[PDB]
């Protein structure tokens, strides 16, 4: 994995998948405590957030993938 | 304000300042408690959220803690 998915993989996120998402950031799926994570890594591979993304409707798009799975 | 950052707002987060972020990001601190929000490149889409560096800092948390 990318250095800085590696390094919340060892924080107790396990990582489940790999997807591309909008905006040109490379998406992670994951799991903390039983709950589902998406984690967008930044273009350079070097930064990621951990959190909800939405888009130019407002749709939460990370909502729509965790809940799919 | 962009599309995805107003539709952030009006789950009931004011947006209070703008900052640069690493990874070509840029950055929006609101308020719910502090919050960051990260627009990417093409200003069309926004993560609410706390973004991690390469070791794994949550860089996001010092920003929110220094207001």
Redesign the interface.
């Known amino acids: 994995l990318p250095?800085?998915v590696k390094?919340?993989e060892?924080?107790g996120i396990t990582i489940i998948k790999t997807f591309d998402?909008?905006?040109?950031?490379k998406g992670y799926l994951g799991k903390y405590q039983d709950m589902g994570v998406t984690i967008?890594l930044?273009?350079?591979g070097?930064?990621?957030?951990?959190?909800?993304?939405?888009?130019?409707?407002?749709e939460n798009?990370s909502n729509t993938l965790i809940e799919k799975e």
């Open positions: 250095a800085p390094a919340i060892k924080q998402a909008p905006g040109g950031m967008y930044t273009p350079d070097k930064h990621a957030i951990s959190g909800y993304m939405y888009n130019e409707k407002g798009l």
